[PDB]
Structure 1
Amino acid sequence: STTCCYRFINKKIPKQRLESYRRTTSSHCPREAVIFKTKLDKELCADPTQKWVQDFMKHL
């Protein structure tokens, strides 16, 4: 609930590089964000206003 993203992963990350983790940050965060996890177990901040994401979340 209070976890927020300061900055986003700009370039698309291939689906083969991401795990199944998905969490949407609070609507009260300065920046609207969805959180994914790489297969290296790193949490990464993503802009839901990027069609690269809307595609991935649909895929999940």
Structure 2
Amino acid sequence: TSTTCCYRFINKKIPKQRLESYRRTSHCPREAVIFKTKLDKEICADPTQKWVQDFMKHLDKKTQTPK
């Protein structure tokens, strides 16, 4: 999971319904959020964008944290 870096970020908000999970990602030349969709696409997003932060919170809240 520490084997790739984001080069460019998506320009527009991803529809919330398409999202399955996310990961982060100094090391890389840019800190990044990588969303994974339900069709298993990985999408680089700008962690400085408000919608990215909101979506991470939403995905955190969707599952109970184990143990």
Shorter-normalised TM range: 0.7 to 0.9
Q: Which runs of 5+ in 1 are unaligned?
A: none
**Greater Cα offset, 14-23 or 28-37:** 14-23
Matched residues, percent identical? 97
Higher helix share: 2
- What TM-score do the two structures reach when normalised by structure 1? 0.81
Deviations 1:1-60 (A, max 9, x none): 24210011110011101112434xx43211110111122211110110000100011112
Q: Between Structure 1 and Structure 2, how many residues are aligned?
A: 58
Give the RMSD, CA atoms, in angstroms: 1.5
Bigger RCO (CA 8 Å, 6+ sep): 1
Using the alignment, how far apart are the partners of 2:26 and 2:52 within structure 1?
17
Structure 1 or 2, whichever has the larger Rg, is 2
Q: 2:10, 2:45 within 8 Å by CA — same for their partners in 1?
A: yes
Higher strand share: 1
Q: Which runs of 5+ in 2 are unaligned?
A: 60-67
Stretches (4+) displaced over 3 A: none
